[PDB]
Nucleic acid binder design. Structure first.
Ligand code: SF4
Ligand code: CA
Length: 345
DNA sequence: AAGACGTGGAC
DNA sequence: GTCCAGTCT
């Protein structure tokens, strides 16, 4: 019942779509950026980051020419930082290889870093009108209910099935609007919990509603604890010691206060050791937890004084207090410094 | 295939 | 506490 369906949806959308920052226009650059920021992040959280990110990087060219340090800083606190590392690379590519023009061909655009099945569809359909599916979490929840599909949405296979379902019901006339409508619906009406089926504009076509199982869909499956000792080294009144994390793995390329994964009870010994401009640490300042998707950091901050006996090399870099605000730190280490400041005062 | 990969704001 | 809001390997 395509046409019938892809009509009440596009209508509801027309009068119900939220005026979000990235919806001011259909510029591929703006769209691409927002589609990447919204991955595993709520709109409310993203809005401020988007305004800021665009003010700072108005065009793809600006983003491409932008240094990498500045880019991570604009993403500071958003999470899954590899998203911006990939976007920065993909953009640098679009300008050097495609003349600052975003490829409008699924195959071409899909080769860029960070661009997956969903992003290919989202950007190209919303910006260029390419009839490709834009299946994300919200969409799978909506489609699993409309068509009462019980396959584990976690399986790529399931996603593929859903992508097939979209190709057979999308308004090939206006794919872009059709793809957003489906997403808004999942964001505003067909919510994870307590879906507002009574107010939904496509209840007529929903099998899950007819069966009374809407709240049970979609179907999906269901971490490692890690002790971390952190050292805040301060100079004879001034600079503190920090280092740029490895470019691969956890919190890649972000700055942090020197630390070590004790994986046990090493403690101040572990940190005092890693030093090898030596130094010694005092008693802890505070211990707290910080969660990631796949692990939890049980942090322990250790105060300390630095004594210069050599140059600051390797990953390390000496930094004056008033300059820490220039470096991008994970939320975890932003608290390490917060706690530290409310300690010495 | 399924673990890696941040962070926060409803329930 | 729990449940989300995609891509790479
Ligand atoms: S009827 Fe209810 S379950 Fe079906 S799509 Fe609308 S909100 Fe989702
Ligand atoms: Ca791809």
């Amino acid at each position: 019942p395509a046409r019938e369906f892809q009509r009440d949806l596009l209508d509801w959308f027309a009068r119900e779509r939220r005026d979000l920052p990235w919806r001011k226009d259909r510029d591929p650059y703006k769209v691409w950026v927002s589609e990447v920021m919204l991955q595993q992040t709520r709109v409310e959280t993203v809005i401020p980051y988007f305004e800021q990110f665009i003010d700072r990087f108005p065009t793809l060219e600006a983003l491409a020419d932008a240094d990498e340090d500045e880019v991570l800083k604009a993403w500071e606190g958003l999470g899954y930082y590899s998203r911006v590392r990939n976007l920065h690379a993909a953009v640098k590519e679009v300008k050097t290889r495609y003349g600052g023009k975003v490829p409008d061909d699924p195959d071409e655009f899909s080769r860029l870093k960070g661009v997956g099945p969903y992003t290919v569809g989202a950007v190209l359909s919303l910006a260029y009108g390419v009839p490709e599916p834009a299946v994300n979490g919200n969409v799978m929840r909506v489609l699993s209910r409309l068509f009462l599909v019980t396959d584990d949405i976690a399986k790529p296979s399931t996603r593929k099935r859903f992508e097939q379902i979209v190709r057979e019901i999308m308004a090939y006339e206006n794919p872009g609007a059709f793809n957003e409508a489906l997403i808004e619906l999942g964001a505003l009406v067909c919510t994870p919990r307590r879906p507002s089926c009574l107010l939904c504009p496509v209840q007529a076509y929903c099998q899950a509603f007819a069966e009374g199982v809407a709240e049970e869909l979609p179907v999906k499956m269901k971490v490692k604890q890690v002790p971390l000792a952190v050292a805040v080294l301060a100079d004879d009144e001034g600079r503190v010691l920090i280092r740029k994390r490895d470019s691969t793995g956890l919190l890649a390329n972000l700055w942090e206060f020197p630390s070590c994964e004790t994986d046990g009870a090493d403690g101040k010994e572990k940190l005092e050791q890693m030093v090898g401009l030596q130094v010694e640490l005092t008693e802890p300042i505070v211990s707290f937890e910080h969660a990631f998707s796949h692990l939890v950091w049980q942090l322990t901050v250790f105060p300390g004084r630095l004594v210069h006996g050599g140059p600051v090399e390797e990953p390390y870099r000496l930094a004056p207090e008033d300059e820490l605000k220039a470096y991008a730190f994970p939320v975890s280490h932003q608290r390490v410094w917060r706690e530290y400041k409310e300690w010495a005062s």
